[PDB]
Design an enzyme around this catalytic site. Structure first.
Site, PDB file in Angstrom:
ATOM      1  N   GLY A 257      35.658  59.336 -13.347  1.00 62.97           N
ATOM      2  CA  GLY A 257      36.891  58.574 -13.963  1.00 62.97           C
ATOM      3  C   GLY A 257      38.162  58.904 -14.598  1.00 62.97           C
ATOM      4  O   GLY A 257      39.483  59.258 -13.613  1.00 62.97           O
ATOM      5  N   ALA A 258      38.050  59.428 -15.802  1.00 61.81           N
ATOM      6  CA  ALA A 258      39.221  60.482 -16.050  1.00 61.81           C
ATOM      7  C   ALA A 258      38.466  60.691 -17.446  1.00 61.81           C
ATOM      8  O   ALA A 258      37.563  60.817 -18.004  1.00 61.81           O
ATOM      9  CB  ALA A 258      40.326  59.827 -16.932  1.00 61.81           C
ATOM     10  N   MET A 259      38.843  62.302 -18.017  1.00 61.11           N
ATOM     11  CA  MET A 259      38.272  62.877 -18.666  1.00 61.11           C
ATOM     12  C   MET A 259      39.283  63.073 -20.115  1.00 61.11           C
ATOM     13  O   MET A 259      40.394  63.288 -20.061  1.00 61.11           O
ATOM     14  CB  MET A 259      38.179  64.088 -18.007  1.00 61.11           C
ATOM     15  CG  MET A 259      36.874  65.372 -19.749  1.00 61.11           C
ATOM     16  SD  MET A 259      35.793  64.815 -20.094  1.00 61.11           S
ATOM     17  CE  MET A 259      35.722  64.853 -21.669  1.00 61.11           C
ATOM     18  N   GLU A 260      38.876  62.716 -20.965  1.00 65.11           N
ATOM     19  CA  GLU A 260      39.746  63.079 -22.877  1.00 65.11           C
ATOM     20  C   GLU A 260      39.539  64.657 -23.644  1.00 65.11           C
ATOM     21  O   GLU A 260      39.964  64.550 -24.597  1.00 65.11           O
ATOM     22  CB  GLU A 260      39.010  61.943 -23.432  1.00 65.11           C
ATOM     23  CG  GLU A 260      37.002  62.396 -24.655  1.00 65.11           C
ATOM     24  CD  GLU A 260      36.014  61.926 -23.172  1.00 65.11           C
ATOM     25  OE1 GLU A 260      36.746  61.555 -22.553  1.00 65.11           O
ATOM     26  OE2 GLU A 260      35.235  61.747 -24.322  1.00 65.11           O
ATOM     27  N   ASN A 261      39.871  65.495 -22.190  1.00 60.26           N
ATOM     28  CA  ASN A 261      40.288  66.252 -22.827  1.00 60.26           C
ATOM     29  C   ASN A 261      40.798  66.704 -23.864  1.00 60.26           C
ATOM     30  O   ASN A 261      42.169  66.249 -23.912  1.00 60.26           O
ATOM     31  CB  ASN A 261      40.144  68.090 -22.163  1.00 60.26           C
ATOM     32  CG  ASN A 261      39.078  67.295 -20.814  1.00 60.26           C
ATOM     33  OD1 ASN A 261      38.450  67.774 -21.333  1.00 60.26           O
ATOM     34  ND2 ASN A 261      39.988  67.099 -19.751  1.00 60.26           N
ATOM     35  N   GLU A 294      40.637  56.842 -22.173  1.00 59.49           N
ATOM     36  CA  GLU A 294      41.138  58.268 -22.522  1.00 59.49           C
ATOM     37  C   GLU A 294      41.875  58.516 -23.710  1.00 59.49           C
ATOM     38  O   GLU A 294      41.373  59.208 -24.834  1.00 59.49           O
ATOM     39  CB  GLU A 294      41.320  59.266 -21.850  1.00 59.49           C
ATOM     40  CG  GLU A 294      40.254  58.727 -19.908  1.00 59.49           C
ATOM     41  CD  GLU A 294      38.935  59.037 -20.373  1.00 59.49           C
ATOM     42  OE1 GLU A 294      38.540  59.397 -20.652  1.00 59.49           O
ATOM     43  OE2 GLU A 294      38.163  57.935 -19.343  1.00 59.49           O
ATOM     44  N   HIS A 297      39.721  57.715 -27.248  1.00 56.49           N
ATOM     45  CA  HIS A 297      39.148  59.125 -27.888  1.00 56.49           C
ATOM     46  C   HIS A 297      39.901  59.605 -28.496  1.00 56.49           C
ATOM     47  O   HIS A 297      38.477  60.027 -28.789  1.00 56.49           O
ATOM     48  CB  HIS A 297      38.673  59.935 -26.045  1.00 56.49           C
ATOM     49  CG  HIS A 297      37.158  59.007 -25.451  1.00 56.49           C
ATOM     50  ND1 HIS A 297      36.054  58.860 -26.641  1.00 56.49           N
ATOM     51  CD2 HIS A 297      36.649  58.469 -24.550  1.00 56.49           C
ATOM     52  CE1 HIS A 297      35.221  58.299 -25.499  1.00 56.49           C
ATOM     53  NE2 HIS A 297      35.842  58.373 -24.159  1.00 56.49           N
TER      54      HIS A 297
HETATM   55  N1  LIG Z   1      34.265  61.699 -20.909  1.00 53.46           N
HETATM   56  C1  LIG Z   1      34.896  60.378 -19.958  1.00 53.46           C
HETATM   57  C2  LIG Z   1      33.517  60.456 -18.317  1.00 53.46           C
HETATM   58  C3  LIG Z   1      33.433  61.617 -17.674  1.00 53.46           C
HETATM   59  C4  LIG Z   1      34.317  62.180 -17.398  1.00 53.46           C
HETATM   60  N2  LIG Z   1      34.367  63.112 -15.944  1.00 53.46           N
HETATM   61  C5  LIG Z   1      32.688  63.172 -16.273  1.00 53.46           C
HETATM   62  C6  LIG Z   1      31.929  64.073 -16.014  1.00 53.46           C
HETATM   63  C7  LIG Z   1      30.137  64.023 -16.241  1.00 53.46           C
HETATM   64  C8  LIG Z   1      29.750  63.887 -17.737  1.00 53.46           C
HETATM   65  C9  LIG Z   1      31.057  62.203 -17.876  1.00 53.46           C
HETATM   66  C10 LIG Z   1      32.068  62.240 -17.380  1.00 53.46           C
HETATM   67  C11 LIG Z   1      35.305  59.743 -20.569  1.00 53.46           C
HETATM   68  O1  LIG Z   1      34.299  58.388 -20.617  1.00 53.46           O
HETATM   69  O2  LIG Z   1      36.091  58.621 -20.866  1.00 53.46           O
HETATM   70 ZN   LIG Z   2      34.871  57.607 -21.793  1.00 59.50          ZN
END
Ligand SMILES: N[C@@H](Cc1c[nH]c2ccccc12)C(=O)O
Ligand SMILES: [Zn+2]
Ligand code: NA
Ligand code: NA
Length: 866
Positions: A257-261, A294, A297
């Site tokens: 879905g999306a990633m909290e970098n 995100e 997070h």
């Molecule tokens: N950390 C992200 C999830 C996520 C996005 N891309 C990923 C690739 C691999 C494992 C987890 C993820 C979330 O929960 O908001």
């Molecule tokens: Zn998450």
């Protein structure tokens, strides 16, 4: 592939405090230079063991001395004979263009972007790729200026320059120590939506949303949602953003879905891009939820991170809880709760009953990417919510405050979080901790007695969790069991005993327990497990009249919906058994009458009415049964829809018409009316054919927004109406250039009740808008067929299984993460009849024999075949 165990956790022999990265970027060959400041914590003779996958090592230096005391082995670079403190320099090459798995540094269209969670950073360079190693990053990016005019990484821009041969560079610094899973890099050419948010204490934050050129018309809602998220986290949790810039990049190629970098979130464009003609009400609310998720997070995941990956729910359960609270505060709390409960009962319970069952804090993992699950996320949130129920909002927030006070700037554990809640609140959570260690869904059985002589009401409550494949031993949990008692007038009976009030959240902590209430002046109708107060199956011998009474009288909207679900369950089970005997649907008149009353009730919130008038999905229905008959379920769902459409035809049309809205607004009252109107349309599609065809075609053509257009198109497919092919072709012709919009159409194709659905789905592998290179397309066509069309997937000839094997044979090599998402329907084989089990077993055995079987699939297949 080797399993890793939570009980094997050990502090790292070496820490890295600071890393300076340089990327000489190119799609074919990227050169990474990584200069890390390391410190030995372990034994003076311990070697430094760096994780690395698919890296071409160029050189290794220690304090600028070319190092001879090293060896590469499987997945690692092992460096011997090191001083206590030193500068490690690694140079290595990687190839973004070859990265079809979309983990590490890869290509998304013309853009280059990263995904590092869980263990993707080791695909970029040799590193301590474990989340209890936190380092301060600086990132220098060198690239072709024309191809990559924007060069982004975490934090703030601290340097920039131009080079010869049309190259340029930018350097970023992020002051906050972080685990490497939070590292991000993006390079490409984008349109940028820029805005600002000023925090309550007055920090001005630059907001920047990067989208593909031409997509700026679809960005404002995501930007609005970001500001909404920031404001809410301040108001509700007292949390402010901690940097100067917040960047979000929407990419088309993304596994999740999306990633909290930190400061540079990377999003699947599905959770960013929206316009009223492309996106539905559900899309808008999902963008809101995921933007919020995100953002949340930033504190629950980033400022406090995870000591190891077995602690994943520490951030995921708590951040899902936060995104649900956000959505619920801003929107309809009842509709949010209802939908989250549908997900728990219909999807998560199924996982907890499967070979892949695990506690929210797993004990054993082969491939960590396999554990981003309904259990870790959704059940994880239910566990957080139980703490909230036990503590109340004030104590819960005190617990949050103590959690941050203790653990800000570190990697923590689930147990650390529970201890903070217990210490701040003085509520004992020692027994409660078993929710982290025990898998499977508890079953709570309730018996009651009313004693008119003594005016006492007695509840005898028992619990048990059936054994699961991962755990032979199960013990009683601390189950918060919320109740409400109603008299004959629908008034709440005060709960009390021995002259003292009793809390309505009962502490069900034993295998069996009795609760006695006094001054119960009338035989009560109980509302049990209010607001789904614990993630459990409830066994209570309801009468139909008790349930219709609750639909009428229950104080919380959730209870009214939930009573309707219990009423329906009885008749779903009845009619599936009937289907198996070749008999038509049977439904008492008084059941149809309860739904009529809902339709005609002027006082009921249309948001609630809409959910009561939305039948349980085929997946929710499946969980009513030990052995699933997916054909009976699908046909019963349709028959029930047709029966209600006939019985309620006049009322459905009246309510459909009454809820017409000429203006389209993404506003909760309007969304509620529209959800009700479309719930009515769904039944109307299954009524008299000519009227159905006219209503549906008219709505598709007159719709001024995608919610109404798609509801009509979906109804045409579901009821196999005459207009179906024409409307489906019209949509294709209008929207084929737009992958996100076409995903909706692929889903309709994949979930079609048509006899020839598999043929159509196979043919669509060649469709102009489909590609195996894009996870969204794969999930919308193939995933939707296998997961959301169980009747067709479980066709008796085994053709659905054969189709999935073919697709997974490709995806095992191309993109194991997406492959592992898609294999899930096959690992449910023990829920099916003997003949289906044997075909599914044969399919799994074929996959088990694949050359170069991914760890991702290996883990699931071996559990399934055990
Ligand atoms: N950390 C992200 C999830 C996520 C996005 N891309 C990923 C690739 C691999 C494992 C987890 C993820 C979330 O929960 O908001
Ligand atoms: Zn998450
Ligand atoms: Na609300
Ligand atoms: Na009873």
């Amino acid at each position: 592939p080797q399993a890793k165990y939570r009980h094997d956790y050990r502090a790292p022999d070496y820490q890295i405090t600071d890393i300076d990265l340089t990327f000489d970027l190119d799609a074919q060959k990227t050169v990474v230079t990584a200069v890390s400041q390391a410190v030995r914590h372990g034994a003076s003779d311990a070697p430094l063991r760096l994780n690395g996958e698919d890296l071409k090592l160029v050189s290794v230096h220690i304090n600028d001395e070319p190092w001879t005391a090293w060896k590469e082995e499987e997945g690692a670079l092992v460096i011997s004979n090191l001083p206590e403190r030193f500068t490690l320099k690694i140079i290595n090459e990687i190839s973004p263009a070859a990265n079809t798995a979309l983990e590490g540094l890869y290509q998304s269209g013309d853009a280059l972007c990263t995904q590092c969670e869980a263990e993707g950073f080791r695909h970029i360079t040799y590193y301590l790729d474990r989340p209890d190693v936190l380092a301060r990053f600086t990132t220098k990016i060198i690239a072709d200026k024309i191809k990559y005019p924007f060069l982004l990484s975490n934090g703030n821009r601290v340097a920039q320059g131009e080079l010869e041969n049309g190259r340029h560079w930018v350097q970023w610094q992020d002051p906050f120590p972080k685990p490497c899973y939070l590292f991000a890099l993006v390079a490409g050419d984008f349109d940028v939506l820029r805005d600002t948010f000023t925090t309550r204490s007055g920090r001005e934050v630059a907001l920047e949303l990067y989208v593909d050129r031409g997509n700026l018309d679809r960005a404002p809602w995501a930007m609005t949602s970001l500001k909404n998220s920031m404001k809410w986290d301040e108001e509700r949790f007292g949390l402010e953003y901690d940097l100067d810039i917040y960047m979000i990049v929407a990419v088309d190629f993304f596994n999740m879905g999306a990633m909290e970098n930190k400061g540079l979130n990377i999003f699947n464009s599905k959770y960013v891009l929206a316009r009223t003609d492309t996106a539905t009400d559900k899309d808008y609310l999902d963008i809101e939820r995921v933007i919020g998720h995100e953002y949340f997070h930033n504190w629950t995941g980033n400022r406090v991170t995870c000591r190891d990956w077995f602690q994943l729910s520490l951030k995921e359960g708590l951040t899902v809880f936060r995104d649900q609270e956000f959505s619920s505060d801003l929107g309809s709390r009842a509709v949010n709760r209802i939908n989250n409960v549908r997900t728990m009962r219909g999807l998560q319970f199924a996982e907890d009953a499967s070979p892949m069952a695990h506690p929210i804090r797993p004990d054993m993992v082969i491939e960590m990417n396999n554990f981003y699950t309904l259990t870790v996320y959704e059940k994880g949130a239910e566990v957080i919510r139980m703490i909230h129920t036990l503590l109340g909002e004030e104590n819960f927030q005190k617990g949050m405050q103590l959690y941050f006070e203790r653990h800000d700037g570190s990697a923590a554990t689930c147990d650390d979080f529970v201890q903070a809640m217990e210490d701040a609140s003085n509520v004992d959570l020692s027994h409660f901790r078993r929710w982290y260690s025990q898998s499977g869904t508890p079953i709570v059985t309730v018996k009651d007695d009313y004693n008119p002589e003594t005016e006492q009401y007695t509840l005898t409550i028992s619990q048990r969790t059936p054994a699961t494949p991962d755990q032979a031993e199960k013990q009683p949990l601390h189950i918060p069991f919320a109740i409400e008692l109603y008299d004959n007038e629908g008034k709440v009976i005060p709960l009390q005993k021995g002259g003292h009030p009793v809390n309505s959240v009962l502490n069900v902590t034993q295998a069996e327990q009795t609760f006695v209430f006094d001054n119960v002046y009338f035989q009560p109708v109980p509302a049990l497990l209010c607001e789904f107060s614990a993630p459990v199956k409830l066994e209570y011998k309801w009468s139909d009249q008790q349930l219709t009474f609750l639909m009428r009288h229950a104080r919380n909207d959730f209870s009214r919906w939930d009573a309707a679900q219990s009423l329906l369950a009885t008749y779903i089970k009845l009619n599936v058994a009937r289907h198996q005997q070749g008999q038509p649907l049977s439904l008492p008149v008084h059941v149809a009458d309860a739904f009529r009353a809902v339709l005609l009730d002027e006082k009921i919130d249309p948001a609630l009415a809409a959910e009561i008038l939305t039948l349980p999905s085929v997946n929710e229905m499946a969980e009513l049964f030990d052995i699933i008959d997916p054909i009976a379920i699908a046909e019963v769902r349709e028959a029930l829809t047709r029966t209600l459409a006939t019985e309620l035809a006049d009322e459905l049309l009246a309510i459909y018409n009454a809820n017409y809205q000429s203006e389209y607004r993404v506003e909760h009252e309007d969304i509620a009316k529209r959800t009700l109107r479309n719930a009515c349309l769904r039944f109307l599609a299954f009524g008299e054919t000519h009227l159905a065809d006219v209503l549906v075609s008219k709505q598709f053509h007159e719709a001024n927004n995608m919610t109404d257009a798609l509801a009509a198109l979906s109804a045409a497919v579901a009821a196999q109406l005459p207009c179906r092919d024409a409307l489906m072709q019209e949509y294709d012709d209008k929207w084929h250039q737009n992958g996100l919009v076409m995903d909706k159409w692929f889903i309709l194709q994949a979930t079609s009740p048509a006899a020839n659905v598999l043929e159509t789905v196979r043919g669509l592998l060649q469709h102009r808008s489909f590609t195996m290179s894009n996870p969204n397309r794969i999930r919308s066509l193939i995933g939707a067929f296998a997961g959301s069309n169980p009747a067709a997937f479980h066709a008796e000839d085994g053709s659905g299984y054969l189709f999935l094997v073919e697709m997974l044979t490709d995806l095992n090599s191309r993109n194991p993460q997406v492959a592992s998402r898609l294999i899930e329907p096959l690992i449910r084989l023990k829920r099916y009849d003997a003949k289906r089990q044997e075909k599914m077993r044969a399919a799994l055995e074929q996959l088990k024999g694949l050359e170069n079987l991914s760890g991702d699939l290996y883990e699931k297949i071996t559990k399934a075949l055990a």
